[PDB]
Coordinates of N, CA and C in Angstrom, one line a residue:
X12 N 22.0 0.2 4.2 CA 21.3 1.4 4.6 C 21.2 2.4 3.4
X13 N 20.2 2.7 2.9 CA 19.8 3.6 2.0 C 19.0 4.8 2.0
X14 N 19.1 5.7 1.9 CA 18.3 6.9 1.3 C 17.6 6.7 0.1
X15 N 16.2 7.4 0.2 CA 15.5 6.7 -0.9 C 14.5 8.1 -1.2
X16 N 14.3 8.4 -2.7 CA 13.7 9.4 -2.7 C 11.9 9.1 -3.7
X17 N 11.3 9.8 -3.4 CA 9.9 8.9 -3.4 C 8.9 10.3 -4.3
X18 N 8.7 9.9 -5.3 CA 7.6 10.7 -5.9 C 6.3 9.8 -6.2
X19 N 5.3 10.5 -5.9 CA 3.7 10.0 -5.9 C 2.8 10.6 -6.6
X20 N 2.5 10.6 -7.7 CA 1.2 11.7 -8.1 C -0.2 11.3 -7.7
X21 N -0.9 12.1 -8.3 CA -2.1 11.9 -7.6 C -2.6 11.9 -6.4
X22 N -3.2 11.3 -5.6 CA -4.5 11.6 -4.2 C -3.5 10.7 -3.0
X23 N -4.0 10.8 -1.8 CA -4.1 9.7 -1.2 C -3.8 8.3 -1.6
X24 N -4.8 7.9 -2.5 CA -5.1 6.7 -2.6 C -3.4 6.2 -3.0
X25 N -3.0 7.1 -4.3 CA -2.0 7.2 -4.7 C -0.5 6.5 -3.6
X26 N -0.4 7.7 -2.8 CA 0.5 7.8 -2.0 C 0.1 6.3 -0.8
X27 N -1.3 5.8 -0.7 CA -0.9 4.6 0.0 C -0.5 3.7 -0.4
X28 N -1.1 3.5 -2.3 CA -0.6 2.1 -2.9 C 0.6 2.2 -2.9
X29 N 1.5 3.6 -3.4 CA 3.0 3.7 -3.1 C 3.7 3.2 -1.9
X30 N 3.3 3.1 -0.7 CA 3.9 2.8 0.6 C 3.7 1.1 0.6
X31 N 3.0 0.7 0.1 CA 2.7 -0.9 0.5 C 3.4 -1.1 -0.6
X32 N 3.7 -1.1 -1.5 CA 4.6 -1.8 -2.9 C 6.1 -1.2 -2.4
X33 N 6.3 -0.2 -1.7 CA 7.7 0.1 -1.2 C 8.0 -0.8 -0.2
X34 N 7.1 -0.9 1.0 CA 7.8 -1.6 2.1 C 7.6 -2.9 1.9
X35 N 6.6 -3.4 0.5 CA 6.9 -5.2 0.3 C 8.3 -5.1 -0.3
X36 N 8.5 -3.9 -1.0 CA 9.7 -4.5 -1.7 C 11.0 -4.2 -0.9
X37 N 11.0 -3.2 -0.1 CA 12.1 -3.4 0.9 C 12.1 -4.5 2.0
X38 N 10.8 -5.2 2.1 CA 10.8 -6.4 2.5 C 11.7 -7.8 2.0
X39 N 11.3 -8.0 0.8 CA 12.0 -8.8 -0.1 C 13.4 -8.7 -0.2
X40 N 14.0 -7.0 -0.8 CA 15.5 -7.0 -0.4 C 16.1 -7.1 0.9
X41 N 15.5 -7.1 2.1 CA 15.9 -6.7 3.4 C 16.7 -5.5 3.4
X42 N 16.5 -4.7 2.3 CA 17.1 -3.1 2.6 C 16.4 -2.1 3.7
X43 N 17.0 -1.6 4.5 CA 16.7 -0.9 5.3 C 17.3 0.9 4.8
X44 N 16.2 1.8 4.9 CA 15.8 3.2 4.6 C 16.6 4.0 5.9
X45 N 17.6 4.8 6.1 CA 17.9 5.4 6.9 C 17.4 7.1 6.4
X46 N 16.5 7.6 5.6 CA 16.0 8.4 5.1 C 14.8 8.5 3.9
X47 N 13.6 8.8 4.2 CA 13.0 8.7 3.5 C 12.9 10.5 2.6
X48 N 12.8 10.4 1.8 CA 12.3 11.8 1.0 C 11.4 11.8 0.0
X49 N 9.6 12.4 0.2 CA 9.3 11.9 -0.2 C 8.5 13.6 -1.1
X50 N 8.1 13.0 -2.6 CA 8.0 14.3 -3.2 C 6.8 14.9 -3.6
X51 N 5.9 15.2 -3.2 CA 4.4 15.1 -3.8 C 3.4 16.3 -3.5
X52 N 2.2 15.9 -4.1 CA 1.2 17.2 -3.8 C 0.2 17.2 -1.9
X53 N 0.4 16.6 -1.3 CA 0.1 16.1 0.1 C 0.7 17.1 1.0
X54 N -0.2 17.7 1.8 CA 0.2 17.7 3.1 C 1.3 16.6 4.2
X55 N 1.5 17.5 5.3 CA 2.0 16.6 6.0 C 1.3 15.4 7.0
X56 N 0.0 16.2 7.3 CA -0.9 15.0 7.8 C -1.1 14.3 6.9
X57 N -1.4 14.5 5.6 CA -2.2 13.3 4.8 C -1.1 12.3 4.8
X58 N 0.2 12.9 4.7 CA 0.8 11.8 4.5 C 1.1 11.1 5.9
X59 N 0.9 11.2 6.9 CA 1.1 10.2 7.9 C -0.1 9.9 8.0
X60 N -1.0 10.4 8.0 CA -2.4 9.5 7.5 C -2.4 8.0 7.0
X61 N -1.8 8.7 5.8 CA -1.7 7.5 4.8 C -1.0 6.6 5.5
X62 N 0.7 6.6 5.9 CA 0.7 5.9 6.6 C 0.3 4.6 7.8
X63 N -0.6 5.3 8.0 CA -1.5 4.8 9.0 C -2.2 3.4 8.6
X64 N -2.5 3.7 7.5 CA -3.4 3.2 6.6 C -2.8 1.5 6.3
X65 N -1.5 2.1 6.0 CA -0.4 1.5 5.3 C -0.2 0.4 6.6
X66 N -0.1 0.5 7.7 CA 0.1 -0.3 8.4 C -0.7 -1.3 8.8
X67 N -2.0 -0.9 8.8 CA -3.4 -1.4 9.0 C -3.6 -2.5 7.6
X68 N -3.5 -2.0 6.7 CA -3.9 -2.9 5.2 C -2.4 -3.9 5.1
X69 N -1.8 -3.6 5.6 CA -0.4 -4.4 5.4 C 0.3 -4.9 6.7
X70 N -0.2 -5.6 7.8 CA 0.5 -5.5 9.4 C 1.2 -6.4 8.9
X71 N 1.6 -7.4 7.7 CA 3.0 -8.1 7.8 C 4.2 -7.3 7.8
X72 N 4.2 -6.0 7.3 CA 4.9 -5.2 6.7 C 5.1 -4.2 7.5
X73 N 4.5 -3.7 8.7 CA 4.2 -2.5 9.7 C 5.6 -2.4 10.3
X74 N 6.2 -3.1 10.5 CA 7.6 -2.4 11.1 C 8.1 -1.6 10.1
X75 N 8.6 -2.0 9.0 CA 8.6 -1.4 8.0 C 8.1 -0.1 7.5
X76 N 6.7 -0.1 7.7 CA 6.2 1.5 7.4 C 6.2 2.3 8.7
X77 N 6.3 1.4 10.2 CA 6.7 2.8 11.0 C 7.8 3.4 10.7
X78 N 8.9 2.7 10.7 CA 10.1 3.0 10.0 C 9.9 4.1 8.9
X79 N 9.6 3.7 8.0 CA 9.5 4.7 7.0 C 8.6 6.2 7.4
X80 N 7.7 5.7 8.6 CA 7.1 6.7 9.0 C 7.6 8.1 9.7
X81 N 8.6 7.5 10.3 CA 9.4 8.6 11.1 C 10.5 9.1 10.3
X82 N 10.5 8.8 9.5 CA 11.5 9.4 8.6 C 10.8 10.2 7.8
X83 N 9.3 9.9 7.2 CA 8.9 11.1 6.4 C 8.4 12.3 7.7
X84 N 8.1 12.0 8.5 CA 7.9 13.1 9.4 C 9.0 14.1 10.2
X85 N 10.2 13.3 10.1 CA 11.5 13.9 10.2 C 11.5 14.7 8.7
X86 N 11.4 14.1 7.5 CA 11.8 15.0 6.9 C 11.0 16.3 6.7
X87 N 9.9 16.0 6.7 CA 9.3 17.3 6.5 C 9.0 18.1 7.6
X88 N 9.4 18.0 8.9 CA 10.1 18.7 10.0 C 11.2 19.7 9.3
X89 N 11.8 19.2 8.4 CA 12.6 20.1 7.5 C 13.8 20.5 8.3

């Protein structure tokens, strides 16, 4: 179980290719995220947006980014 801290620059687009190269690659290790923190120019919608997105373009991986999901919404619940 890990804490993981996550910087994105750029748009959207940015922050979705970030979430699919994260959750393949926590795929591959079978590490599991007990915190996500994520650091960027985004709203809080855009970023569960993106999310969204993330699960749709990637459903092998979608447990994984719900997962990840509620944790960036937890964190920035703050």
């Amino acid at each position: 179980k890990v804490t993981v801290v996550l910087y994105v620059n750029g748009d959207e687009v940015a922050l979705v290719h970030a979430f699919m190269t994260t959750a393949s690659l926590l795929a591959k290790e079978g590490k599991l995220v007990e915190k996500l923190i994520l650091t960027s120019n985004f709203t809080e919608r855009t970023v569960r947006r993106a999310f969204d997105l993330v699960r749709e373009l990637l459903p092998a991986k979608a447990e994984i980014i719900d997962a990840l999901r509620e944790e960036a919404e937890k964190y920035f619940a703050e």
